[PDB]
Structures are given as structure tokens and as C-alpha cells.
Amino acid sequence: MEAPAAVVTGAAKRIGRAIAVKLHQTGYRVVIHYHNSAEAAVSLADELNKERSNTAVVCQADLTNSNVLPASCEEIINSCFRAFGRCDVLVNNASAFYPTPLVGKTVETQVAELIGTNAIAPFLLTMSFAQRQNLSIVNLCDAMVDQPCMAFSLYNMGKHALVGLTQSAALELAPYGIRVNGVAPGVSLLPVAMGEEEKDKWRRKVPLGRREASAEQIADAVIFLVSGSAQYITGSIIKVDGGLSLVHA
Amino acid sequence: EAPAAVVTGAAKRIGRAIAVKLHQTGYRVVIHYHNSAEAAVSLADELNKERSNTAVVCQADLTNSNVLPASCEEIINSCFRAFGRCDVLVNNASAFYPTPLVQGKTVETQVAELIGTNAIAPFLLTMSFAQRQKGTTSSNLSIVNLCDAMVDQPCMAFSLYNMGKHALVGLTQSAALELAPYGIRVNGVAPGVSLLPVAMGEEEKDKWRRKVPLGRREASAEQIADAVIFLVSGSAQYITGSIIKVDGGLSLVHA
Amino acid sequence: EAPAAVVTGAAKRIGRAIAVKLHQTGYRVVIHYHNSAEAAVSLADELNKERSNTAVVCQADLTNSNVLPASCEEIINSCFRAFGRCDVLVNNASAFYPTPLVGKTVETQVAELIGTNAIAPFLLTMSFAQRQKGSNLSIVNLCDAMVDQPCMAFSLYNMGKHALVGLTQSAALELAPYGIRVNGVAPGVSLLPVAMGEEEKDKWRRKVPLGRREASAEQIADAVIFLVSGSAQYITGSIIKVDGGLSLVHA
Amino acid sequence: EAPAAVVTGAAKRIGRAIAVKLHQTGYRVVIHYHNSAEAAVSLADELNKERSNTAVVCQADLTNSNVLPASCEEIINSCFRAFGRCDVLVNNASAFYPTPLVQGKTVETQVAELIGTNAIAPFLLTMSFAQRQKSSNLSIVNLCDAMVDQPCMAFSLYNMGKHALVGLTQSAALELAPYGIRVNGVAPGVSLLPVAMGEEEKDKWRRKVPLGRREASAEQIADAVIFLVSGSAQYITGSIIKVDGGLSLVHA
């Protein structure tokens, strides 16, 4: 059919959910990938299908690195083709985020989760996306990669690797007409359980309005990058951070 | 009431495309120019034919000098005089030519033109833009600087031009930080190769085109304008201090 | 009270020159290797001939797996076993080969390219830091000046090297309170791949503004020596490009 | 015989340390100064006491003006006159003060000083240095700033000048590589604090630095310059070495 289709990873909640909704509002059919949040994913799909029948499906997968991750990533892309006959956009949003101090989970599990979700799964999804082909990929990066959270080495390594993928894939996929870009939030949606006192500490550091980005503001940048208004843009990462990364210690 | 924009060096090429696209989006525009009077007036006539009293021209040299601050203050004042407001500033005007380090313009003229157009004038226009707002919620004020995706892999023998564009990156960042509390966003658009020089031969143009991964061709002026329009829009209201490369992957390509 | 250094992938090429220069500077060295056993033992022999009991070898595969943490721990332990201390870690070992997006399985390619270039450095950094509770301690990561202008079809490799820049920064921040500095050296073109043909090698050489030639291994090693030295005691989280201007050259 | 170096702004603080360490390494030195004649001569006297006729001074204002090209030519010429050669240029002199965007010196004077010292003078000195050349180890070292991407509030012009200096470093490295002239930078974070800065403010800055919660000594900055001019950096050009104790890694 004539409406384009997008895969959004980690789409049940928060930023991924807002991205899925905005893509849907723009006219895309969506694959809502999720790991543990089945109820939320299904709720979103039902909402979107109420708006337009047969325009949303869910796809469950763990994006932890392992021997089966390549197959899992191939399956996610295939789900979009099975549902909608095409796959125009891939949004790599899903992400593990927790500290891994240099000095519970084994360290190999932490590597698998943090590097898998933030870098390896994006790479494998990118491979599967390209092999099956205004086509574009958008990677959710992090404006703070050069001024990282203390004791978040593996997470930071994963997001750095994702910048490399964005560049490498933009270069390699350009001949196929597939653009590859990034959106780099600073502080957006905070953890719900984070105390407001801690939330406000982060908010007050942001020059532009002393507030976090909404999920919708992050989604707006993704929508620009997949649009016809970005058709010469490839290998670019758009910071959406309210000036946070410009603020010295 | 429609918002108003100043676009420097807007008579032709990329600056014209930005002015046109802003005007199509609903802005009133000040078309600043230096030598290209006929082209500036022609553009303003076309825009005014589309919507009466929505375009004016403003002449100024943006070469650095002791009067440049007054010239820059006057450009911003022209927008307020014509339209009663100034919501957007686009720093597009630019001198571009080689200044070899080893060997009829004096070097001091070259510094004045290359650093003036690309960096000092943007700074002064930024100051004047910000100061004029002090006499004013639904507002959406911003500045867009035309940067250069190739600043870290520069053209051979273009040191002063390169220095000017690096300075413009610094201004983008410094002004984003300092003007955020006033609700003025400050961002950049960094072309790779877009409209090639008028005097460049076709063989040389094709040499540049063939290096671009995405389509083996230069950006259209409209493609560059699209990124400016995004940055001024409500879809970018949390974006400040960002420079969007619009280069078809050119900067990713090794030697 | 000679300090001791671990250099990964030290049997040949750049890692060998690093081990040699560290030894010349007065370090005792652990020559880590994977497959190049003969070269590793030959080097240790040369170094021990110069100063007895100053070099040992340590074999390990640095491919990512569930045993990699134990392997990395063992490398660091080998330094303490031999020398009773470990002052310097040089993360040099590296897999480098294309992985196009469009008979190794992709999972093996991920494990080798991301393991050697990023995960092993991380685990070795962890083990190095945790063994320190007893100076001029530092870590040097061999990065790549071309990470932002990467080789076509080397996505996994490039991801690994980007991850290595992240580790360098993150570990510099986190280990600064323990006095452990963490920096990088980023070659452009240095010793060319053994499998590369002469015409192709010459193509790469001609790209380099400063002398139209590749860096020697000794030139790369000179920057490592500086970073571990007393003349770099306030330097942490810095990556020194050693590329003859190659990265400045547009397409 | 011995190589020769020009260090701008060499009478005090970081520039003085750089000149001292180059001299100790075996260089003859031109000590450039603007207002600090007494300190400049005191340094030369100290260095000449160590090795006769190995240090001279050169006065010049590095503010941008119509005479700045001539002034920069003279600084380079002074090295050739004293020592018959000029192997190293260190661009250290620098104006540093706020220039707020929203509201003493006029703005154009502030442009002349901040952009002149931090960028235009280095460009003109680079040009003169290269023109006068056209085995050897010729290089230029620019004193940059590790904080350029997380700048001081209200320091737009200073920041623009330092960004321009990054651009010069890269452009000149590319263009001068065929002549065997390397061009690099050293980027301090917090080193010797402003003389006017209050002691409590100094401590606020010190406590931000991960590596030792202190500023860099001038000698530590000089150590990186020494490396860059040495034979141990013969393949290094277009590189900027941060010497910041991890300060630039620390988020807000």
C-alpha cells in the first residue's frame, strides 16, 4: 500500500512512544517494538488502530547481545514487511541505561545489555533494513557523550559506538539512497521514580528554559530527519539539548 | 501579525532561497545586500507582488571597520522600522577566497572582509538583535548562522576564511549559552557543497559533485533553506547551540 | 623499583615498538600476544638479554565472550606475578577487517571487532584499576585518527574505535581520583596491512601531507611514551592524533 | 648550532615557563612582550646568565590594526637577526576578558584586542615564519583552550578568537606540511588563574578538576609544548593536546 511504514524500537513508553505517535500522525504505519512492556505496547497499538485501522502492530524482542540477536533483528525488520509490505524508516530508540563502575549482573551481562541495546542491535537492524531494500534511519544518541555520567562507561561506550555506526552507515548506505542520522537529547524525560529534588537539579542546569525536553520535542527532530525537508542530510546528529552540553562544570 | 526576519546577503543564491522560503512560511523579510542591488530589488518586488508590504531591502557592507557596529545596528533597525518586530536573524553573507600563507588586496583588507563577514558582523548583528528585544510567551526568537561542514577538512590556502567560519561556530555556541535566558535560540546550518561558484568550470564542479556520497551532486539552495526553516520553526523550540550539517555525507569521506 | 607495563598485541608492528620503547625507558614489560607466539617469545628474549628478568609473555584471545573478563584479569595478574606491580596498560591489540552492511558469522565479527577494540580495553581497565591499592599510573588506548572519516564497509571496526574514545573519556573521569590517567594515541596511516599490495600502499602514502609517507611504529610509540611520562602528569582524557595531517585532507 | 624560538607574551606566567623550558632544552629565545618590559628583561638576564647571548627581547602590540602585519614581521625578523634562524614559533600572547552580548572600551577595540591577539596575530606570525624559511625540525605551537566548546558565560569574542585559532592550526598544518613545518596546539583547562580572581573563586575552579582538584602549573603546560617541538613529535601536525586534568569531561 501507499502509506510508508516505520519500525521504532523500545516504542511502548516515553520517547519511543512519542516518536511512534508522531510518525503515525504524519501518515506512517508503525511497528511498535517492545521488550518487557507488552501491556503498554498493545495499548499504544490499539489507540493507533482506532485512529486508522491496520496501521500499527507490536513486535516483541530482547535486544541484548547474544548468538540469536542477528536473527531477532532480522525478524523485527521482517515483521514490518509482513505487516505493511515495506519498511521506509527505522528508529533505533531502545536503550539500557545504568551504571557500571570500574572499581547482581555479571560484567558480561552488563556488556551484552548496554552495548547490545545501544550499538549492536542498531547495527544488526541497520544491516537487515538495508539488505531488504525516502528511506532513512534515525539513531537516538546522547548529547552528553563527551561529558558523561560518572561510572557509566559501558553505556557511554555504547552511545559512542552508535555515533560511529551513524557515520559509517551513512557513508556506506548513501549509494542505496538510505540516509542515516541521529538525534541527541540532553536531558529529556527523567526516571519517574527519581525524586523531584534530583529532577530539579538537572532541570536548573539547562540554559533554555531550565526544563527537560518533552518526548514530543525529541520526536519533532526525528520527524524532520525522516521528512523530505532533510533529503540531503545524512551522517548528521542533531542535538536537542536546550544548551545543556555547552555548560561548563 | 506575521513574524519578520532579516537575511544577510539575500539577493541571490542560498540567501535568496532562505528569504523566499521564510516568506512562503509567512515571514516578512529584510533582504540585506551589499553589491547586488538589482537582484535584491527584483527579489523584493516578487515577494511584495505575492503579499503586499512584506519585503524590504537593506544595503550594507559587512567588512569589519569602526562603523560596522552602526551598520549592523541599522540592519536590525530596518526590520523594526518596516515591520515593527524582528523575530529571526539569518547570518548568511560571506566572503570566500584564498589567502595563501606563502607567496591587489592588503592582508588587513582580507582580514577585515573574511573575518568581518563570516564572524564579526554575525556577532554585532547578534548583539543588536538581542538588545532590540529588551524593549518588547508565544514568541519564537532565533538566530541561524550559515556555517561550513568542511571546517575541519578545509580548502587548501583558505586560512582566513576557515578561521572566520570557526569563529562563527564559537559565536553560535557562546550566544546560544548567553541568550538562552532571553528565549533566543542560536543555531547553525553547515552546507558541504551547495551552489558552486559562478566562475567555476564544469569540469571542476563535477570533481566536487562526484565526491558526495548521497546522490553525487551538490545541495540545492532550497535544501539548505529547509534546514534553516526547521531551526526557526516550533519543531525546534528546544534546540539551541546545534549546528546541522547538510552535506550529503561529504565530510565523512576520507582523502 | 623499575615500573612495569602491559602492552596488548605486542609481538609485532606498533605494539612491538611500544614494548621496546617502554623497555628502553626502564619499564619491565608484559608482552601480550594471541597467535604470534614465536615473535612474542623472540621479543621477550631480546629484551631479557638487554636486562635480565624484565620481560615476560602472556597469551590471550581478546575476542568478546563470557570468558573474556577472566582472560583480561589474567593478563593484569601476569604483570603482578612477574613484577609485583603494574604501572601502565597499553591497549593496542586490534582486529581490523571489513564487515559490509549489504566465512565468519556476524556474531563472530561483532565479538572480534568490538571485543578487541573496546570490550577488552574496558575489562583490562577494570582489572588494572581494581588491582591498584598499592606513583605515575596510566593507561594509553590506541585509537584511530580516521574515526570520523572511516574506511568504507568497516562499520563494526569503526564502532569499536568510537567506543574506545568513550572508554578513554569515561575512565579518565572515573579514575582521576585514584591518580590513574587515561589517554589515547590516534594513528592515521602507520604500518600498512601486511596483505595490502604495493601500489595500494603507495596510494595511501601519497595522501599524507607531512612527508607523503606512513608513520613508523616508533613515531607512534613516541606519543605513548610521552603520555606515560612525567611530562604528561596533568594530561588525562586526551587523544593525541599522530597522522601527518591526514585527517585534515578533504575528499 | 642551536635552534631558536619565538614565544609571544613570554614575560610572565605560561609564556615565561615555555621560554624557560625551551631555553633549558637548548634553544635560543626571543622573549616578546607588550607592556611587561621589566619582566621581559629580567627573564632575558636570567637566561643569558646561564648561556651568554641566547636570549633577546622584542616589544610589540598584537592588537589588530593597520600596523599589525609589520609588527608581526618584526617579531620574526628579530629572531633571524639575533640568531640567524627561527625554528619554533609559540603563539601564547592573549587578551582575555568578557564582552557581554546584552547591555570603557568600544566594541571594535574589544574585537581588535581579543580577535587580534588570539587569532589575527598568530595568523600573521605564521605567515612571516613560513615566508622566511621558504636535519630541520620547524614547528609552530598555538596556545588554545580546552573549554572552547563549554565556554565562559559572556566571553563571546574571546571564544571566537580561540575557535579561529583552532581553524588556523588546522589550515596552517595542512598548507605548511609540504614545507616540513608542523603546526599544533596545546589546550589548557585551568592553569595559572587570573591575578584579579578572588581566592574563593580560584578554589571553586580548582575543585572542579578531576585530576588532583588543582590547576595546572605553567611548567605542565610548557611540558606539552616541549613535546610538540621535539623530535618525538615529528609526525604530529594539526593536533591539539588538551592539558586539562579532565576538566572538559565534567558535565554541568
Ligand SMILES: NC(=O)c1ccc[n+]([C@@H]2O[C@H](COP(=O)([O-])OP(=O)(O)OC[C@H]3O[C@@H](n4cnc5c(N)ncnc54)[C@H](OP(=O)(O)O)[C@@H]3O)[C@@H](O)[C@H]2O)c1
Ligand atoms: N530520557 C533522556 O533524558 C535521554 C537522554 C539522552 C539520550 N536519550 C536516549 O533517547 C532514547 C529514549 O530514551 P528513554 O528515556 O525514553 O529510554 P528508556 O525509557 O530508558 O528505554 C526505552 C526502552 O528501551 C527498551 N529496552 C531496554 N532494554 C532493552 C533490551 N534489553 N531489549 C529491548 N529493548 C530494551 C525498553 O523497552 P520495554 O519497556 O518494552 O522493556 C524501554 O522502554 C534512548 O536511546 C536514550 O539513550 C534519552
Ligand SMILES: NC(=O)c1ccc[n+]([C@@H]2O[C@H](COP(=O)([O-])OP(=O)(O)OC[C@H]3O[C@@H](n4cnc5c(N)ncnc54)[C@H](OP(=O)(O)O)[C@@H]3O)[C@@H](O)[C@H]2O)c1
Ligand atoms: N555555496 C556553498 O557550497 C557553501 C558551502 C559551505 C558553506 N556555505 C555558506 O552558506 C552561505 C551562503 O553561501 P553562498 O554560496 O550563497 O554565498 P555567496 O554567494 O558566496 O555570498 C553570499 C552573499 O554574501 C554577500 N557578501 C559578500 N561580501 C560581503 C560584504 N563585504 N558585505 C556584505 N555582504 C557581503 C554578497 O552580497 P552581494 O551579492 O549583495 O554583494 C553575496 O551575494 C555562506 O555563509 C557560505 O559560507 C556555502
Ligand SMILES: NC(=O)c1ccc[n+]([C@@H]2O[C@H](COP(=O)([O-])OP(=O)(O)OC[C@H]3O[C@@H](n4cnc5c(N)ncnc54)[C@H](OP(=O)(O)O)[C@@H]3O)[C@@H](O)[C@H]2O)c1
Ligand atoms: N597500522 C595503522 O596504520 C593504524 C592506523 C590507525 C590505528 N591503528 C591502531 O594502532 C594499533 C596497532 O596497529 P597495528 O597495525 O600494529 O595492529 P595489527 O598489526 O593489526 O594488530 C596488532 C595485534 O593485535 C592482536 N590481535 C588481533 N586480534 C586479536 C584477538 N582476537 N585477541 C588478542 N589479540 C588480537 C594481534 O596479535 P597476534 O599477532 O599475537 O595474533 C596483532 O598482532 C591498533 O589498535 C590499531 O587499530 C593502526
Ligand SMILES: NC(=O)c1ccc[n+]([C@@H]2O[C@H](COP(=O)([O-])OP(=O)(O)OC[C@H]3O[C@@H](n4cnc5c(N)ncnc54)[C@H](OP(=O)(O)O)[C@@H]3O)[C@@H](O)[C@H]2O)c1
Ligand atoms: N591561564 C589559564 O588557565 C589558561 C587557560 C586556557 C588557555 N590559556 C592560554 O594559555 C596562554 C597563556 O595564558 P596566560 O594565563 O599565561 O596568559 P595571560 O597572562 O593572560 O597573557 C599572557 C601575555 O599576553 C600578552 N598580551 C596580552 N595582550 C596583548 C596585546 N594586545 N599585545 C601583545 N601581547 C599581549 C601580555 O604581555 P605583557 O604582559 O608583556 O603585556 C601577557 O603577559 C594564552 O593563550 C591563554 O589563552 C590559559
Ligand SMILES: Cc1ccc(Sc2cc(N)nc(N)n2)cc1
Ligand atoms: C538525568 C537522567 C535523565 C534521563 C534518564 S533516563 C535515560 C537516559 C539515557 N541517557 N538513556 C536511557 N536509555 N534512559 C536518567 C537520568
Ligand SMILES: Cc1ccc(Sc2cc(N)nc(N)n2)cc1
Ligand atoms: C567547492 C565550492 C563550493 C561552493 C563555493 S561557493 C562558497 C563557498 C563557501 N564556503 N562560502 C561562500 N561564501 N561561497 C566555492 C567552492
Ligand SMILES: Cc1ccc(Sc2cc(N)nc(N)n2)cc1
Ligand atoms: C591504510 C591502512 C593502514 C594500516 C592498516 S593496518 C591496521 C589499521 C587499523 N586501523 N587497525 C589495525 N588493527 N590494523 C590498514 C590500512
Ligand SMILES: Cc1ccc(Sc2cc(N)nc(N)n2)cc1
Ligand atoms: C578559570 C580561569 C583560569 C585562568 C584564567 S587566566 C587566562 C585564561 C585564558 N583562557 N586566557 C588568558 N589569556 N588568561 C582565567 C580563568
Ligand code: NA
Ligand atoms: Na562530520
